[PDB]
Design a binder for these strands. Structure first.
Ligand SMILES: [Mg+2]
Ligand SMILES: [Mg+2]
Ligand SMILES: [Mg+2]
Ligand SMILES: [Mg+2]
Ligand SMILES: [Mg+2]
Ligand SMILES: [Mg+2]
Ligand SMILES: [Mg+2]
Ligand SMILES: [Mg+2]
Length: 103
RNA sequence: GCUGUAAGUAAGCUUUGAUCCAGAGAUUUCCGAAUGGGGAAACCCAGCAUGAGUUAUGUCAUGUUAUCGAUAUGUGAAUACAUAGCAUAUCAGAAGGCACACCCGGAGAACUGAAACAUCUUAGUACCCGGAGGAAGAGAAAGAAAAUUCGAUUCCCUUAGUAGCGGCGAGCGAAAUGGGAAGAGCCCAAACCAACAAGCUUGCUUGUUGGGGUUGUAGGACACUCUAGAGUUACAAAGGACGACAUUAGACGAAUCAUCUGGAAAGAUGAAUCAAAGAAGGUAAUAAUCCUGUAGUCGAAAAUGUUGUCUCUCUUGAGUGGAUCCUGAGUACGACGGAGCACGUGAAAUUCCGUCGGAAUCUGGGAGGACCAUCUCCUAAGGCUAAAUACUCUCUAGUGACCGAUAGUGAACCAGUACCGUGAGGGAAAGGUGAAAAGCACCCCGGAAGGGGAGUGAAAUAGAACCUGAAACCGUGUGCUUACAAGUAGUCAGAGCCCGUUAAUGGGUGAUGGCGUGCCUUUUGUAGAAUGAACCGGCGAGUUACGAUUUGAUGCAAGGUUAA
RNA sequence: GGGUAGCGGAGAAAUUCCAAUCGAACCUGGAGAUAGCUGGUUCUCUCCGAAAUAGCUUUAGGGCUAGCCUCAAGUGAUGAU
RNA sequence: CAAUGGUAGGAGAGCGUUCUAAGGGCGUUGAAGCAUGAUCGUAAGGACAUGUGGAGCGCUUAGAAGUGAGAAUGCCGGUGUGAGUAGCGAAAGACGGGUGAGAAUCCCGUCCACCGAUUGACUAAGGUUUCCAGAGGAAGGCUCGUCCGCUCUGGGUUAGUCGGGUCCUAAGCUGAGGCCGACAGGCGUAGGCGAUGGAUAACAGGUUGAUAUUCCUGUACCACCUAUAAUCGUUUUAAUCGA
RNA sequence: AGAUAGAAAAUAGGUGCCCGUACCGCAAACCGACACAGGUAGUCAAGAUGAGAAUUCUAAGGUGAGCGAGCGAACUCUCGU
RNA sequence: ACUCGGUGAAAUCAUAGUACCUGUGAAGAUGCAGGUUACCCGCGACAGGACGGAAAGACCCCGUGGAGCUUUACUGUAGCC
C-alpha cells in the first residue's frame, strides 16, 4: 500500500522502469494516478461548461499492484513494513531504516 | 479522504482525529393485536386534565380515556339480612405475530392397494384447529424375568421381516434378551403432633400455621437410644463480588530480479529467495516472493452468553422392637358400547373413554397373554426431574467427480415484480463493450434517425441492442446448366463445359439412358387417401435408496464376518 | 345500499343460474391420485433368433405356467434320415 | 475348411459427451468454440491445414454419470409459407391561403353536407392527470402526419351557505355482559355503524390557458363569541334558562 | 321534572374547521383484451307539421367518423324498377 | 370484388419439377405398370379431387374407467318411534 504523494516506480504496462509522483489515491478501487503514467487521449466535445474541446491528454489510474515505493536511501525498489514508534504505525523501507511520507 | 446506489455540477466537510468501523444511548411520523368512538389500514370525530393562543369564541400542544383479568376498597336491588349489580383505584397479568421446520394434544378424509368391492389398505396420512418449548413427550417400577434383573426414562444396532395379526387375502408387524450413547433421584398426601387462632369446657375437638415421614429387606409414625451434607437442571429459593478463557471492532505478519514475445506478462528463458505461510482471491495473460491475505502471534471502552471460586441461602442423621395406627375411593374392578396396544369388544389379561354398578385395607392389593392353585416379582389410584434424541427462519466459518443463465431458486438483472383474475390465487421474459470509458474532438450528406471519413483502442463486422455469433430464413454477385417436357427428385452409366487438391486412379455442373411410390408409429398386411412432425436450434424418458436371487471377481475356508 | 355459497344456495321448473362451457363453480392442498389404454423412449457394429399356440383365468386387445428363443455350466451318443 | 438376411428378443465387443484421481503435455509465436476442405478407420467417429476467435484445453490409465434425439397433435425461442393476398371497424366532402425536409390527412377561411328527445348542454357511478401552454416525432394512432387521449418541460382543482363529515335513522352488519357451541366459533340484548331516504343558512354578474352557488364586484343570510342595552325583575316563578 | 340572581331590547365589532372540486361521463378517458357498430342510472330539451318526447327539414350547439385515388367485369351484399 | 399509391395478418404445411385413362394395390392413385396427352411464367375466375381444413367421432363397441339418477340390489346411514 502507498501514500498520497510519495514517489514510486511502475512495473506494469507500457510504463515500467519509470518514476513519478502520485497525485490521487481513490482507495475505494485501489487505483492510483501517477504523473506521466498511462497518458490518455480523451475526445472532449465543445459544450457550455467547456467552450471548445479537443483531445485532452490527462492521466488515467492504475492498480496499486503496479507501483512500488523507492528506498529513500538507495532508490532501490522495495516493499514496505511497519514499526511501532511510540505506538504509531510508521513505515519502513524493509531493506533499510525509516521512510518518510510527508507529502 | 468523503458527501450511498448514480452518473453527474453545485455548495461543502475533513489531520483540532472528522470519514468510516464496532459497542452503548437518544430521536423513532401514520396504520396494524390496535386499545378514546368510528372506519373502505396508513383516515375521520371526540371526552377529561393540563398548558399555548385569542378581549373571548373558533384553534393548537402534551398526557389520558378500549376489553378482559386479578386484587383492593365504595355502594348495593327484586327482599329482611345478604347477594346480584354498579362505581372506582392498582398491576411490563392476557391478547397479536411467526420457521411452510421439530414437538404434545382435539378432531380427522379420499383417490389409492385388494388386479371389482363392503371388512381391511392408503392412515391415524393430508388438511384443519388448541398448546408449547428450545427442545418437547417419557421417566424413577403395582417394571421386565424364571434372572444371578440393563435395576428410572429415552435413543442407536440386533433380535427380524422372526413370534404373531390378517375377507388368514391384500397386506400389517413387534417385544424381551444381548451390544452401545447417556452417566441423577426426588418431593407432597395419610397416620401423628409441641404450641397456638376459632366452636367447645378445655374432656372433646376444628384449622392450614407448621412440623412428621413418604416405602416391599414392608416403609414410615409409635415406643425406645442416638450425634449438630445440599443448592438455584428435579431435589426451597433470591442476589453482589472477584477472577478465568472465549465473541460483537481490529493489529503485526517471510521472501524476485533480469531478458524475450506482447497492448499488457504472472508465461517462456536464466539466475535467486522465503516457507509454522505453495489455503484463497485479485492484478492489462497462467504469481509462494506485486496487492489483499495465509501459517503464526497479538488485541478490546463497552454490552453480552459462559465458568472457578468466595459469599450467600437452606438443614438431622441412625438403629431396634412392633401392641395399635397409617400408606393416595366413587378408585381398582365388573357389565354394555367404542378406541389403543404388531394383535379386528375380543381372552383382552396389559390399557383407556362414555353408561350403569362397585371392593380390600398387610392377617391386604396388583402382575407373570383364557386362566386359575402354588411360586416369583411388585406396591396403583398425587407431583417434579438434566443427558443421550428431533429440526433449521437465522448468524459465523468452511466443504462439494453440485448448476454454470432453456441450468441452478420462480427470481444471478429493482421478482412474488410485469402481467392475468372480482377475489382466493396464478405468475413470467430478461447476465456478458473494453485492460482502462479511453463511450468516437472535428469534417462531410441528412430535418432527424442513420451513415462515411478522421481520431481512441491490441481489436470498433469490440460503438453502447456492444464477447464468441451456428441453423432455419432473406438478399447481391456469378462458373455450369435449363423454355417437346409426365419428375418420393436419388442412384448408376456417361458426353460437353469450367476449375486445380489433404495429388488421388482430383473438384464443380450435368445433354442423354437404366433402375427407383419419403420417414416414423401401428399392424396379418401401409407409397398409403391410417397416425405423427411447417422448418432450425436448445431442453426433453429404465435412475437412486434399501432387501432378495444369480453370474463374474477377490480375500480365506470348517470356518467367514461384523453392526451400533 | 344489502342478504342466502357448493354434501350449499336460488329457481312462474329449463338439469335453469351461481363472474364468457355447472347431472354439481373456482382456487389451492392430498398429488407425480389411478390409467390392464394411446403416444414417445436418444450412439455403433458383431453372433444367434422367435411366437401370434395349449391349459387355466370377472378371462377374451390383460396375466400365469407350458411350448417356441438366447446365454453359461454340466451330461457325452442319447438327436436326425 | 465351414459360417455371416433378419423383427419381439438374448449375448458380446466397442465409438462418443461432462466431471474426478494420477502421470505426461499443449497454449496471445493464439486455447475452446465457429466455418471451409478433394484426409483416415469396418461403424459409432478420429485427425490435419487455412480463416474468424481472444483464453483456456488436450493425451494415457482408471473411476463416476443430469451421457448421445427425429417424430410424444412434446415445451421454449427464432424464421418461414398462405402473400404483397384478406383486412383497413357503419357516415361527405370540395377548394383557396399558411405552415414545413415532407401534406387528401395539421392550422385559418369560404362553400357544401350530417345530428338536432340529440352526435347538444349538465350531473352521477367508474377511470385517475387523459385537463391547460410551449416543444418534439422513435414508438402508439389499422394510411400519412408538421397532428393528438403519444412523448419532454412547466403549469392547473380556492366554499360558514354546493355534495358529504359533521345531525337522524331503515334494510343489513357488528354486538359489552349473556345463550349455545369438540377447539375454531354461531347466535343475540342494551348500544353502535350504515343512505339509495329525513333535517340543514348564497343569489346575480364579471373573470383566465386551465377553476369558480368556491375567486372578485354587488347585495344577503345561518350559527357562535365579545362590548353595550333603553330597566325584564322574590331569581321559586322571570326579559326568560331547559332534559 | 330541575336550574338559576340573570341580558332581552332597539346596536357595534369579530369568528366560522376536514373532505370532494381539473378532466371524460350514450364515451377514443367508463364495463367489453382494441381510438371495438354492444352496455352505461338521472336532469334541460326550441321552431315548422301534428294529438304526440311519432315523422321529414331546421334553430341553440356539436360533427364530416384515422386510409385513399381510379375503373364502373364476373360473383356476393344492400336498394329501386 | 378488380387496377394503382400506403399499411399489411391467419388457419394450413413430411421434401416436392404435383397430368389423364385402363389396371395393380390395405380391395376408391400428382407420385406404382402400360398407354395417351402436354413449350416456360403470370392475372382474373369455379369448386371435382388432394378420402381438403378446423375438433385424438355429437353414432357404435370395449375398459373388472368415471359421474349424475332410480329401486321390493347389497351394506350402511342422518333422522323418527
Ligand atoms: Mg401421411
Ligand atoms: Mg397423397
Ligand atoms: Mg399433421
Ligand atoms: Mg332447495
Ligand atoms: Mg345446461
Ligand atoms: Mg377431413
Ligand atoms: Mg378417439
Ligand atoms: Mg351431444
Amino acid at each position: 500500500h502507498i501514500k498520497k504523494g510519495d514517489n514510486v516506480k511502475v512495473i506494469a504496462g507500457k510504463d515500467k522502469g519509470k518514476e513519478g509522483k502520485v497525485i490521487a489515491t481513490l482507495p475505494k478501487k485501489d487505483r492510483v494516478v501517477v504523473e506521466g503514467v498511462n497518458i490518455m487521449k480523451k475526445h472532449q466535445k465543445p459544450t457550455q461548461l467547456n467552450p471548445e474541446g479537443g483531445i485532452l491528454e490527462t492521466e488515467a489510474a492504475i492498480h496499486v499492484s503496479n507501483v512500488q515505493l523507492l528506498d529513500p536511501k538507495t532508490n532501490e525498489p522495495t516493499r514496505v513494513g511497519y514499526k511501532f514508534v511510540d505506538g504509531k504505525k510508521v513505515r519502513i523501507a524493509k531493506k533499510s531504516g525509516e521512510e518518510i511520507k510527508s507529502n
